[PDB]
Design a protein around this ligand. Structure first.
Ligand SMILES: *[C@@H]1O[C@H](CO)[C@@H](O)[C@H](O)[C@H]1NC(C)=O
Ligand SMILES: CN1CCC[C@H]1c1cccnc1
Length: 355
C-alpha cells in the first residue's frame, strides 16, 4: 500500500485550503522514482467550482482522503501487474487543485479557492528529496487525463527545480497518458454560454486567468501573453520540451469526443472518427516514444489491466521498458519505442479494453 503524507508546508493547499499531499511507498535499494499525477477534469469559475466542491470534493480537499491507497497498474509493486517498474519508489499525488496542475494562486480575501497544482508538484519533489529522492537515478513524472496534460506542463519545471537545487544526476522524464488532445474540431472556439457546452479552448483560457495558471517557459515564449492556452495541447507544447516524454494516447480518446461534443453510426460520424484517428496519428509521427492504440477509451497506466493492451505485438509495459533501454547512457532489436496503430476504427486492435 501507499501511505498518505500531508505537506509540511501547509500553505501549499488543495482548493479549499486543506493541505495537499502525496501517497508514498518506499523501495529501499531502488533509485527509480515514479510520481503519478491524478486526473479528473477541472473547474474554471466560481460557480462550476462550487458545483465540483459539492459532489467531487475529494478532488478539491484532503479532508476525507484515506490514510492509504493501493498501487495499481504502473504503481503496483507486483511484477505480474507491473512488469515495467514494480521495484520502484511509488508516489501517487492526488489531484485536489482543479487546474490541470497549472495553478500558482493561493487563497486570500480575493480568492475563495486556491489553485496551486504547479506548486504542489514542486513541494512534493522538495519533500521527497529528504526521503531518498536525492539519491535517485530516474524520476518519472507520470499522469493520466488532466494529470497527463499536467506532466507536459510540469516535467521541465521539475527538471529545472532539481538542477537549481543541486541534483543534476537525477534524470527527469515524463509519461503522459490520455493528456494529448486536439483543438481543431470546433465550430466556434470562443463561445462559453454555460459550463457543459463551453468550447474547450475557451474553458482553458478562462481557467488560466482564474487559476493564475503557468505553462512551460519555452512554450510561453512562443505563444506569448494571453495565448498560454495553446500550451495545454500536446502537439503544441511537446516540441518545446527538453525532458524525454513518452506519450500514451488512445487514438479515439473518450475525452476528445467529449470536448468535440460527439456522443448505428452514419457517414458524418464515421468520417469524424476516422479523421480523428488519422489526425492523432499524424501529431504523434515525430514523437520518438509513444504508444497509441486504436481504441475508444480513456486513461490506462494505473489500471490493473494495462498489461494486456498491445500495439503491433508489443505491450505498454514492454514499450516503456524499451524506452528505458533507449535512454541508458540507434533503435533496439525487437524492443520498439514508437507504437501507433494504423488501423482506422475503434477496436480494430483486438486488445482494446472492454468493460
Ligand atoms: C511554502 O510554499 C510557498 C509556496 O511555494 C513558499 O513561498 C514558502 O516559502 C514555503 N514555505 C516553507 C516554510 O516551505
Ligand atoms: C486536460 N484535459 C484531459 C482530458 C481532456 C483535456 C482537455 C483539454 C482541453 C480542454 N479541456 C480538457
Amino acid at each position: 500500500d501507499l501511505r498518505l503524507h500531508l505537506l509540511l508546508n501547509t500553505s501549499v493547499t488543495c482548493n479549499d485550503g486543506s493541505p495537499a499531499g502525496y501517497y508514498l511507498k518506499e523501495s529501499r535499494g531502488s533509485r527509480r522514482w515514479l510520481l503519478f499525477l491524478e486526473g479528473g477534469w477541472y473547474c474554471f469559475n466560481r460557480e462550476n467550482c462550487d458545483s465540483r466542491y459539492d459532489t467531487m470534493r475529494r478532488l478539491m480537499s484532503s479532508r476525507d482522503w484515506p490514510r492509504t491507497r493501493t498501487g495499481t497498474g504502473i504503481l503496483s509493486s507486483q511484477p505480474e501487474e507491473n512488469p515495467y517498474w514494480w521495484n520502484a519508489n511509488m508516489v501517487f499525488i492526488p489531484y485536489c487543485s482543479s487546474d490541470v496542475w497549472s495553478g500558482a494562486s493561493s487563497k486570500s480575501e480575493k480568492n475563495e479557492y486556491a489553485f496551486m497544482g504547479a506548486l504542489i508538484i514542486q513541494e512534493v519533489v522538495r519533500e521527497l528529496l529528504g526521503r531518498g529522492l536525492s539519491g535517485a537515478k530516474v524520476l518519472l513524472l507520470a499522469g493520466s487525463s488532466a494529470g497527463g496534460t499536467g506532466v507536459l506542463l510540469n516535467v521541465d519545471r521539475v527538471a529545472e527545480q532539481l538542477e537549481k537545487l543541486g541534483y543534476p544526476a537525477i534524470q527527469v522524464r515524463g509519461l503522459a497518458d490520455s493528456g494529448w488532445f486536439l483543438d481543431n474540431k470546433q465550430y466556434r472556439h470562443t463561445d462559453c454560454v454555460d459550463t457543459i457546452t463551453c468550447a474547450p479552448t475557451e474553458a482553458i483560457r478562462r481557467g488560466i486567468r482564474y487559476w493564475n495558471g503557468v505553462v512551460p517557459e519555452r512554450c510561453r515564449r512562443q505563444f506569448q501573453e494571453g495565448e498560454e492556452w495553446n500550451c495545454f495541447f500536446g502537439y503544441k507544447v511537446y516540441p518545446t520540451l527538453r525532458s524525454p516524454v513518452f506519450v500514451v494516447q488512445w487514438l479515439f480518446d473518450e475525452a476528445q469526443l467529449t470536448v468535440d461534443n460527439v456522443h448505428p453510426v452514419q457517414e458524418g460520424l464515421r468520417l469524424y472518427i476516422q479523421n480523428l484517428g488519422r489526425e492523432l496519428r499524424h501529431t504523434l509521427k515525430d514523437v520518438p516514444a509513444s504508444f497509441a492504440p486504436a481504441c475508444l477509451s480513456h486513461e490506462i497506466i494505473i489500471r490493473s489491466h494495462w498489461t494486456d493492451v498491445q500495439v503491433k505485438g508489443t505491450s505498454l509495459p514492454r514499450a516503456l521498458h524499451c524506452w528505458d533501454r533507449s535512454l541508458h547512457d540507434t533503435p533496439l532489436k525487437g524492443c520498439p519505442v514508437h507504437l501507433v496503430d494504423s488501423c482506422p476504427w475503434p477496436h480494430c486492435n483486438p486488445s482494446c479494453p472492454t468493460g
